[PDB]
Design an enzyme around this catalytic site. Structure first.
Site, PDB file in Angstrom:
ATOM      1  N   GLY B  16     -59.426   4.286  11.452  1.00 50.30           N
ATOM      2  CA  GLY B  16     -58.329   4.756  10.575  1.00 50.30           C
ATOM      3  C   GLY B  16     -57.485   3.585  10.068  1.00 50.30           C
ATOM      4  N   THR B  17     -56.294   3.910   9.558  1.00 46.64           N
ATOM      5  CA  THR B  17     -55.229   2.959   9.167  1.00 46.64           C
ATOM      6  C   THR B  17     -55.277   1.686   9.999  1.00 46.64           C
ATOM      7  OG1 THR B  17     -53.669   4.789   8.628  1.00 46.64           O
ATOM      8  CG2 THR B  17     -52.569   2.614   9.207  1.00 46.64           C
ATOM      9  N   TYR B  18     -55.223   1.882  11.319  1.00 43.66           N
ATOM     10  CA  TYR B  18     -55.385   0.716  12.177  1.00 43.66           C
ATOM     11  C   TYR B  18     -56.089   1.061  13.461  1.00 43.66           C
ATOM     12  CZ  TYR B  18     -51.549   1.795  15.332  1.00 43.66           C
ATOM     13  OH  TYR B  18     -50.741   2.390  16.339  1.00 43.66           O
ATOM     14  N   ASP B 130     -47.443  10.516   7.343  1.00 44.85           N
ATOM     15  CA  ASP B 130     -48.836  10.523   6.929  1.00 44.85           C
ATOM     16  C   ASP B 130     -49.539  11.771   7.399  1.00 44.85           C
ATOM     17  OD1 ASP B 130     -50.898   9.382   5.334  1.00 44.85           O
ATOM     18  OD2 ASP B 130     -51.680   8.322   7.031  1.00 44.85           O
ATOM     19  N   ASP B 148     -51.972  10.160  14.960  1.00 43.60           N
ATOM     20  CA  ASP B 148     -51.775   8.885  14.197  1.00 43.60           C
ATOM     21  C   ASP B 148     -50.360   8.743  13.707  1.00 43.60           C
ATOM     22  OD1 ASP B 148     -52.000   6.514  12.859  1.00 43.60           O
ATOM     23  OD2 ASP B 148     -53.851   7.026  11.779  1.00 43.60           O
TER      24      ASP B 148
HETATM   25  N1  LIG Z   1     -61.858  13.732  16.717  1.00 44.58           N
HETATM   26  C1  LIG Z   1     -60.877  12.859  16.677  1.00 44.58           C
HETATM   27  N2  LIG Z   1     -60.588  12.303  15.497  1.00 44.58           N
HETATM   28  C2  LIG Z   1     -59.612  11.376  15.492  1.00 44.58           C
HETATM   29  O1  LIG Z   1     -59.209  10.715  14.359  1.00 44.58           O
HETATM   30  C3  LIG Z   1     -59.934  11.039  13.167  1.00 44.58           C
HETATM   31  C4  LIG Z   1     -60.084   9.776  12.323  1.00 44.58           C
HETATM   32  C5  LIG Z   1     -61.331   9.997  11.509  1.00 44.58           C
HETATM   33  C6  LIG Z   1     -61.684   8.678  10.783  1.00 44.58           C
HETATM   34  C7  LIG Z   1     -62.009   7.643  11.841  1.00 44.58           C
HETATM   35  C8  LIG Z   1     -60.703   7.299  12.504  1.00 44.58           C
HETATM   36  C9  LIG Z   1     -60.199   8.542  13.239  1.00 44.58           C
HETATM   37  C10 LIG Z   1     -58.923  11.044  16.576  1.00 44.58           C
HETATM   38  N3  LIG Z   1     -57.919  10.176  16.748  1.00 44.58           N
HETATM   39  C11 LIG Z   1     -57.623  10.250  18.035  1.00 44.58           C
HETATM   40  C12 LIG Z   1     -56.533   9.466  18.791  1.00 44.58           C
HETATM   41  F1  LIG Z   1     -55.740   9.069  18.007  1.00 44.58           F
HETATM   42  F2  LIG Z   1     -57.075   8.647  19.332  1.00 44.58           F
HETATM   43  F3  LIG Z   1     -56.084  10.192  19.458  1.00 44.58           F
HETATM   44  N4  LIG Z   1     -58.400  11.123  18.637  1.00 44.58           N
HETATM   45  C13 LIG Z   1     -59.206  11.637  17.721  1.00 44.58           C
HETATM   46  N5  LIG Z   1     -60.187  12.546  17.805  1.00 44.58           N
END
Ligand SMILES: Nc1nc(OCC2CCCCC2)c2nc(C(F)(F)F)[nH]c2n1
Lengths: 255, 297
Positions: B16-18, B130, B148
């Protein structure tokens, strides 16, 4: 607006958990309240130089007081702690924090040291950086003046800022209470008016409960021009703060 | 408490973003977690502000509709944020549901839960900034959670001017697009309104390709605002008198499948004047939610 009461309430809970230990400087073998005053006065200068928010200043002080409450620091490293704290508060609070090199420049430590201290500060504070400050309370109190007054605000901010300098006595007061004292002291100095009724309802503080802090703050105000540290007085001469530090303090309060 | 030797990577979730997000398991306890790995600029800007804000804020925010931060594992090189594992984000779920649509009761449940999470943030002086489906995580039990907080910030009362470069374009509120000197909790509500509409119609409400395109898409749908509907519009920095003046669309067209109550709520979440835009707190009391249930997805 809405959440204002919820927020006030929650900051009143958090200022108790983010309070440093009142006695801490006595447990510091190599540093003193006077060294701390110097440090904080330098951070004031740094805030000016980089045009940082006053909130950033207050946060940095909180980070420093909590760090020194747990960690022994030799005098040669006190400014390193302070530089890292200012860096972190900038990262937390500023739209455009100065870069790390700018914080190296203003100090002499190496960049690596500053950056390593940053990480140590974060560990010691366990990333708990969203600390309530004198400033965050003032800002809410400012919504109550009838009517709003420029000099009252700037003078209040000035008095809250002076409190940052002197661990003895201001470490023993919570941010909300110092803010209360500062607000009332400023209001009375400028407009002859008093701690508003609406703030009594909100805060449950009265002029009586604020008296101890207020007595101390009034003294601080009167003795300010002879204080070893002068950067806050200087800063608050600028029109940016309507020259408020030039104003004459009242001599009594008749509470 | 943690140390990376006990975690086994199961799969990378993405970037993601970071940082980078992985699915991992605790070898000793069998707990499945989500790990967000963040690189430290050890040379030579250090710990990023985004990480500082995400961590500090998420440690204060304890709520069933806010992703739970379980641990922060330090090294000199890397920070690992240990979070509870949620298997799906709402973006991926809306795609998966594109053929059949998300059932209205699940939409209602999800919106309800998002508002509870957001009211909790706002109550605790945190703006998310966001909110978008990719940042909303769902489990198999019918829960959804805000995630996030890399772009979040602790706000003051009253707010001062904050970062302008804010909210993913499609979910971005008019006041930001118009370059307002002050914005607050209303920006998050706008985002949620967009998301609510998107769950219903199965397409982004305002899929702008540029700032100006985004504004104009908003205007074409909600009507070009004037001083009557939004006192102050015309004194905003990026407001222009040359803005075409579109008529507002009948909400039965904006969101056909929605009932009167749904349309009422959506139009309050998308009110132009941030001051009159509904609060998360107030939205929870909206009649739309009277019969809210908790379906499994
Ligand atoms: N299934 C899922 N998706 C997440 O973030 C979705 C985006 C999709 C693009 C790749 C970066 C994370 C998540 N982000 C997290 C966290 F932020 F770690 F908690 N858990 C997550 N579980």
């Amino acid at each position: 607006p809405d959440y204002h009461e919820d927020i006030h309430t929650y900051l009143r809970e958090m200022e108790v958990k983010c309070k440093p230990k009142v006695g801490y400087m006595k447990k510091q073998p190599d540093i003193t309240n006077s060294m701390r005053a110097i440090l904080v006065d330098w951070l004031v200068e740094v805030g000016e130089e980089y045009k940082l928010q006053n909130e950033t200043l207050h946060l940095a002080v909180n980070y420093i007081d909590r760090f020194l409450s747990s960690m022994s620091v030799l005098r040669g490293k006190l400014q390193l702690v302070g530089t890292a704290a200012m860096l972190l508060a900038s990262k937390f609070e500023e739209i455009y924090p100065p870069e790390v090199a700018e914080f190296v420049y203003i100090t002499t430590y190496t960049k690596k040291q500053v950056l390593r201290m940053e990480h140590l500060v974060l560990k010691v504070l366990t990333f708990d950086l969203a600390a309530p400050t004198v400033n965050q309370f003032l800002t809410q109190y400012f919504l109550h003046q009838q009517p709003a007054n420029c000099k009252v605000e700037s003078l209040a901010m000035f008095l809250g800022e002076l409190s940052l300098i002197d661990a003895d006595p201001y470490l023993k007061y919570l941010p909300s209470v110092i803010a209360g004292a500062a607000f009332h002291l400023a209001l009375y100095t400028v407009t002859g008016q008093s701690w508003p009724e609406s703030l009594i309802r909100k805060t449950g503080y009265t002029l009586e409960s604020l008296k101890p802090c207020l007595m101390d703050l009034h003294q601080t105000y009167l003795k300010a021009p002879q204080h070893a540290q002068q950067s806050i007085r200087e800063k608050y001469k600028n029109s940016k703060y309507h020259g408020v530090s030039l104003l004459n303090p009242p001599e009594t309060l008749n509470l | 408490p943690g140390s990376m030797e006990n975690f086994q990577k199961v799969e990378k979730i993405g970037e993601g973003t970071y940082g980078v997000v992985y699915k991992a398991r605790n070898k000793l306890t069998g707990e499945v977690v989500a790990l967000k790995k963040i690189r430290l600029d050890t040379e030579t800007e250090g710990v990023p502000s985004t990480a500082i804000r995400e961590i500090s804020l998420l440690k204060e925010l304890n709520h069933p509709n806010i992703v739970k931060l379980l641990d922060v594992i330090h090294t000199e090189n890397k920070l690992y944020l240990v979070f509870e594992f949620l298997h799906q984000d709402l973006k991926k779920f809306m795609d998966a549901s594109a053929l059949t649509g998300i059932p209205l009761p699940l939409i209602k449940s999800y919106l309800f839960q998002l508002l509870q999470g957001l009211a909790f943030c706002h109550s605790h002086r945190v703006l998310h900034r966001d909110l978008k489906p990719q940042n909303l995580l769902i489990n198999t039990e019918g829960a959804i959670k805000l995630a996030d907080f890399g772009l979040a910030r602790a706000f003051g009362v009253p707010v001062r001017t904050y970062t302008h470069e804010v909210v993913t374009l499609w979910y971005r509120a008019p006041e930001i697009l118009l370059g307002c000197k002050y914005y607050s909790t209303a920006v998050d509500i706008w985002s949620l309104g967009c998301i609510f509409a998107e769950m219903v119609t199965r397409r982004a409400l305002f899929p702008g390709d540029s700032e100006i395109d985004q504004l104009f898409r908003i205007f074409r749908t909600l009507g070009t605002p004037d001083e009557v509907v939004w006192p102050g519009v015309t004194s905003m920095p990026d407001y222009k008198p040359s803005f075409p003046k579109w008529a507002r669309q009948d909400f039965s067209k904006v969101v056909p499948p929605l009932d009167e109550d749904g349309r009422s709520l959506l139009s309050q979440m998308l009110h132009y004047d941030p001051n009159k835009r509904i609060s998360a707190k107030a939205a929870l009391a909206h009649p739309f939610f009277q019969d809210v249930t908790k379906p499994v997805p």
